[PDB]
Symmetry: C3
Subunit: 239 residues, 3 copies
């Protein structure tokens, strides 16, 4: 896929909501049809049928499958066999081996556990990888913590650390870099601040969970002693 040619507004849509697929595609640059945490355990078989029955443009659609080693991932790959989709998102990505076993698909690795953070470079370097994303909430959950954000709304340090880790690992191997979802949908101010910062440090994408967030992300990724790299910054802004 030419995912880099699409804009920065990517949108999760649970795959057991086929009635919303067309609206998601209309709102977003890329749709992530979700078979993992956005779909209840009992609804995953229905989500797999909808995946086959209600196709979206495979050049602008990614499918988030279930974690490596799970029975659900096996059922997901069987369902995907009857689709035109070529790119999957791997949640709880924790090793190069988990990515490699998804070949010949293209893989966006979603790092959201301590093991994935420790192994981020190996995951990014794996041959099927085309992008890296991070997830603050599963990260904190699997660390045994209870909140990813400080009282003032900023991420706690370990989340900020993993965010930088994933940005560097993705960029070191020429992969797309995707920034974490902003869970507080009505907090447009906070999303605006995060997406502006993400654009400023070189993320390619901010992933959204609600279509109202897509215009905020698209606008944030547009701009408002000098050495050679500072001129590159100015040329990036013009672009």
């Amino acid at each position: 896929m030419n995912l880099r040619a699409a804009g920065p507004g990517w949108l999760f849509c649970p795959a057991d909501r086929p009635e919303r697929f067309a609206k998601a595609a209309a709102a977003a640059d890329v749709v992530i049809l979700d078979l993992e945490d956005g779909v209840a355990e009992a609804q995953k078989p229905a989500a797999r049928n909808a995946l086959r029955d209600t196709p979206l443009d495979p050049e602008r659609t990614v499918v988030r499958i279930n974690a490596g080693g799970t029975a659900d991932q096996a059922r997901d790959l069987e369902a995907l066999a009857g689709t035109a989709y070529t790119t999957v998102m791997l949640p709880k990505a924790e090793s190069a081996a988990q990515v490699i076993e998804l070949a010949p698909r293209d893989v966006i690795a979603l790092v959201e556990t301590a093991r994935g953070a420790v192994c981020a470079a190996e995951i990014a370097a794996a041959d099927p990888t085309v992008g890296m994303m991070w997830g603050a909430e599963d990260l904190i959950a699997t660390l045994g913590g209870s909140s990813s954000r400080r009282a003032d709304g900023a991420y706690r340090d370990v989340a900020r650390h993993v965010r930088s880790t994933i940005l560097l690992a993705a960029s070191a191997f020429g992969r797309l870099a995707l920034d974490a979802v902003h869970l507080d949908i009505l907090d447009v101010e906070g999303l605006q601040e995060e997406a502006r910062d993400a654009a400023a440090v070189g993320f390619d994408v901010t992933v959204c969970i609600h279509p109202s967030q897509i215009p905020v992300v698209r606008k944030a990724y547009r701009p408002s002693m000098v050495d050679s790299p500072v001129l590159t910054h100015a040329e990036t802004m013009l672009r």
Copy 2:
């Protein structure tokens, strides 16, 4: 040991103060009997005798030995032979080899140097490791610096970086994660802030240097769009 079943308030007690061992055990969840920096060089032989003569519960007691390759560590392991203790804390932990040479003991690696930070994952993965701790002051000292904290009391960035490094490395290999001591004993407000943050990101323990800090830590580790990990956060709080 079932160190994870004990509470989060761990307390250093210098091993040349056997008159305080019982009070430390009464105040804390786990006692770290210290043969390293809490005991003056000339007092380490006396500390080793006290270690043998005044036993604490080996299921709730860790012994901090001296650094790898030192004559003091050799004397420590000889003294420990005449005790029931099974878990040691290794200061200036800098390689998997330093941990492995302490087998068959269980090892809590205290990372507090640049080399230890760079090798944190290898240290965490070593077979004897059961926990990781970090130390800001020895870290800054061995970097050649002069203070670990900013004017406003927050840790400087390299200390925050190592803290996250150790949390991730410990959690990636299922080890206990221990947060650094708060040296300003009377600064209860600052300890409260740090321990609340440590609990929120998934540290298991905040280590203390004064028994007055234990109630602050124990209280801080108790709690005051929703996806699956956010529900895990709420379940962790209830637990």
Copy 3:
């Protein structure tokens, strides 16, 4: 070279300005004669001739060459053959191999790309390495970003992350640690804050781009429950 014995004020001087070499040497502790980004592409041959024609003290002078694999670096090493300089600075340093191929010269690796950050420990450990520096602007540029600093002037998180990475990697292998240039020359307050912090965490050097910054750096590297490392901090201050 005994670069560690020189003070902390290092100063870039473009090598096509030989009329300024003597003033740079008078102002700074160490001069970095620059064949890379400080010299326009068309002016690099003239800079190489000036490098040979206008010598500075090789015990207090480093030469920044061009990036590995470039034709310019090849021309730089040919020009350096007719000089007494023994230490080079490698920009966009990205692998141990790039450092090793500069043997038998001493190498200060300037890490300023995502790949260099991911490989910082391997770069620091390479046998020719004698120091590590980081560069925020090329880092942000090669990440595809557009600014290294927040609205309040602080570095964005990924720059802070790479700064700590380089400090730890340098110190883990006994290399000099050099902090990034402060591009806002007239912002003496901001330089003072950064250099004080750099000195406090154990950087050896803050690199400057204007001679007016050298006194600020030199002054900042002078100083204005207690365990063993806190006493080391106090002894470092007295020293």
